[PDB]
Every structure is written in structure tokens, then in C-alpha cells.
Amino acid sequence: ACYCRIPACIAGERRYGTCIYQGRLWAFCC
């Protein structure tokens, strides 16, 4: 399962779609 976009190990994969929730997008983090 993928989490949201947070200043973390965002590398590896980059999600194109963005999640609008409280102003926080979801990057591909695993």
C-alpha cells in the first residue's frame, strides 16, 4: 500500500496523480 506525500523516501517511484486532502498530495512511497 502507498502512503501520502511527505518529505521522506519519495524516490524509487514518482506518482503523477495528486490527492487533495488537507492540502497534502500522495506520492509513490514504498
Curated annotation (Swiss-Prot):
It comes from the Eukaryota. The modification ADP-ribosylarginine is found at residues 14, 24. Changing residue 26 to A: Almost complete loss of bactericidal activity. Disulfide bonds join 2-30, 4-19, 9-29. The modification Phosphotyrosine is found at residue 21. This is Neutrophil defensin 1.
